[PDB]
């Protein structure tokens, strides 16, 4: 049974990845499959199984972490499907671990654009940051929408829990990291901001 189920997990993944679904149901299924695969492989290592089928089994610490990662993704998305946002189009990329974990950590986000920070006046010292216009956050009152954006101070987001912008990344601090003057300017699209840490 362990092998059969393992194949089902792996087959579900490879197949879904080729689909590129809009349905959130499918992305829950994807992570369920990853969770299954890695848990089974974890259990196999803890019995001293080094090869299953004719496939080396990854070290338990690798299986465990991927299982943990898939667990969080799965339940998070299962919680999401139960809200108003669960009806929207959701992609594999919107549903990626890398998306979830990028800035700000541990929330879902879609609607991307790039922001260009230039330091010191040097065109050569230009960084690109990704703002996501929509953020989907787990809070004590459950999941709810937040809207992010950029300004001369940093990248921020706006929830209706407080009349204010909550910055998660500050350009002045980036200017400290990467610049030699403190001076930076911030191109959005048709907007340039300028600041000094």
Swiss-Prot record:
Keyword Transcription regulation recorded: yes
GO-annotated molecular function: DNA binding; DNA-binding transcription factor activity; nucleotide binding
Keywords for the protein's UniProt record, in alphabetical order: Activator, DNA replication, DNA-binding, Early protein, Host nucleus, Oxidation, Phosphoprotein, Repressor, Transcription, Transcription regulation
Post-translational note: Phosphorylated.
Cellular localisation: Host nucleus
GO cellular component: host cell nucleus
Primary localization: host cell
Domain of life: Viruses
GO annotation terms (biological process): DNA replication; DNA-templated transcription; regulation of DNA replication; viral DNA genome replication
Chain intervals for the UniProt region annotation (Transactivation domain): 1-197
Family: Belongs to the papillomaviridae E2 protein family.
Assembly, per entry: Binds DNA as homodimer. Interacts with protein E1; this interaction greatly increases E1 DNA-binding activity. Interacts with protein L1; this interaction enhances E2-dependent replication and transcription activation. Interacts with protein L2; this interaction inhibits E2 transcriptional activity but not DNA replication function E2. Interacts with protein E7; this interaction inhibits E7 oncogenic activity. Interacts with host TAF1; this interaction modulates E2-dependent transcriptional regulation. Interacts with host BRD4; this interaction mediates E2 transcriptional activation function.
Function of the protein: Plays a role in the initiation of viral DNA replication. A dimer of E2 interacts with a dimer of E1 in order to improve specificity of E1 DNA binding activity. Once the complex recognizes and binds DNA at specific sites, the E2 dimer is removed from DNA. E2 also regulates viral transcription through binding to the E2RE response element (5'-ACCNNNNNNGGT-3') present in multiple copies in the regulatory regions of the viral genome. Activates or represses transcription depending on E2RE's position with regards to proximal promoter elements including the TATA-box.
UniProt name for this protein: Regulatory protein E2
Segment of the intact protein contained: 3 to 199 of 410
């Amino acid at each position: 049974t362990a092998c059969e189920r393992l194949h089902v997990a792996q087959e579900t993944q490879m197949q879904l990845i080729e689909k590129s679904s809009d349905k959130l149901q499918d992305h829950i299924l994807y992570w369920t499959a990853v969770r299954t695969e890695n848990t089974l492989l974890y259990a196999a290592r803890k019995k001293g199984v080094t090869v299953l089928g004719h496939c080396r089994v990854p070290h338990s610490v690798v299986c465990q972490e991927r299982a943990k990662q898939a667990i969080e993704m799965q339940l998070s998305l299962q919680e999401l499907s139960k809200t108003e946002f669960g009806d929207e189009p959701w992609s594999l990329l919107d549903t990626s671990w890398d998306r979830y974990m990028s800035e700000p950590k541990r929330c879902f986000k879609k609607g991307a654009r790039v922001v260009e920070v230039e330091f010191d006046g040097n065109a050569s010292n230009t960084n690109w940051y990704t703002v996501y216009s929509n953020l989907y956050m787990r809070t004590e009152d459950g999941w709810q929408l937040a809207k992010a954006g950029a300004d001369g101070t940093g990248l921020y987001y706006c929830t209706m829990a407080g009349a204010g912008r909550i910055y998660y990344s500050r350009f002045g601090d980036e200017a400290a990291r990467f610049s030699t003057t403190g001076h930076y300017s911030v191109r959005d699209q048709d907007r340039v901001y300028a600041g000094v840490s």
